[PDB]
Amino acid sequence: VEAPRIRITYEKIRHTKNHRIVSISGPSYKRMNVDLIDYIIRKWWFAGKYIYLMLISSNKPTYVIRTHMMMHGRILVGNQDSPTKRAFMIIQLDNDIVLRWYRSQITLLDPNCLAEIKTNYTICTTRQAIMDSIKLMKYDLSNNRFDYNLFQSHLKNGINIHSSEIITDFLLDQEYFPGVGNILQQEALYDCKILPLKKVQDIDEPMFDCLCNSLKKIIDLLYESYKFRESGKEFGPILRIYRKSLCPLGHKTIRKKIGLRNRMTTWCPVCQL
C-alpha cells in the first residue's frame, strides 16, 4: 500500500472523529495490552505509509494508535453485520459504525514514552516518533499539508547524504519520500527515462525536478482514478511499466530485485539509460 491509498483510507474513516469506543477486540488489540473502552476518537492524520489515531479519555492517559497497512492491508468501515473473519482489530463506535483492520501492523504509541523504537526511517523515542509524523506530513506528496519549498530544501540534503546509493533505494526512503512505494518509484523512473541502477550523485538538477514532478503526477492520476470509481465511472489504465513484458514503445523489459531494499523493479534498458 502506497500513496495515495493512505490518503484515501484516511478520507474514508476520518468522520469517525468525536465518537466513543463502545467495544474493541482482536489479536492486535490484545497485543497492545491497554483497555481502550469508552475512549474518544480525537483526531486522525496520516504521513507517508502511516495512519495515526489519537484517543483521549477524561483523567486517563492519551494514546496514539499507528497503523501501517501491509500488502492487501485495509481499514474498512462497516457495521455489526459485516464479516469479521481474519480481522486484526475491531472497533465498534457509539453510532453503530464498525472499523475493521486487515493485514496491517498496528502499534500503540504513548506520547509520554521515552523508549527507543524503530520506525521506517529512523530509531527514536516513542514521543519523538509522534512529533516527527507532524513534520513528515509536509514531505508527503499526496498530503494536503505538502509544502513544496520545504520539501525541496529537505530533498537537497538527502541527495547529498545518500549520494552513493542507487535511485530506486533513494526513492523508497521514507524520510525523504514518505508514501512512495514500489509501483510509484518504477513508474516515475520510466516516465523520466532514468535507469533504476543509476546512482543518486549521477542525476542532475533538471532530472531530480523531473522525478518529483513525475511522482506527483502519477499520484494525481491514481487519486483521480479513485474519484472516477467513486462516481461509478472508469478512468482507464495508467500504469506503463509495472509488471509489463513490453514497454509501450515495444522494447523487451528487464525485471529483477535491486538495491539494498531488494525490491522487484521492471525497467526498459533502451528507454531508461
The residues of the shown chain that bind Zn ion, judged by CB under 5 A, are 247, 249, 251, 268, 270-271
Q: Which is nearer to Zn ion, 154 or 240 (CB)?
A: 240
Per-residue cell: 97: 459504525
Nearer of residues 140 and 191 to Zn ion, judged by Cβ: 191
Secondary structure class of 73 (helix, strand, coil): strand
- Phi/psi for 42 (5° steps) reads -85, -45
Work out the angle between the directed axes of helices 5-13 and 205-230 (0-180°, nearest 10): 40
Nearest-approach distance from CB 266 to Zn ion, in angstroms: 11
Looking at beta carbons only, is 92 or 266 nearer to Zn ion? 266
Distance CA 124, CA 55 (A): 22
CA–chain centroid gap for 80, Å, is 28
State which residue, 91 or 271, has the beta carbon closest to Zn ion.
271
**Minimal distance, residue 215 CB to Zn ion, in Å:** 20
CB of 252 to Zn ion, least distance (A): 8
Contact criterion met (CB below 8 Å) for 203 and 23: no
Question: Which of 127, 125, 259 is closest to 186 using CA atoms?
Answer: 259
CB of 253 to Zn ion, least distance (A): 7
Residue appearing with cell numbers 492486535: 28
Q: Are the C-beta atoms of 179 and 142 separated by less than 8 Å?
A: yes
Provide the grid cell at 31.
497485543
Pick 138 or 244: Cβ nearer Zn ion: 244
Given the complex with Zn ion, which of 115 and 249 has the nearer CB atom? 249
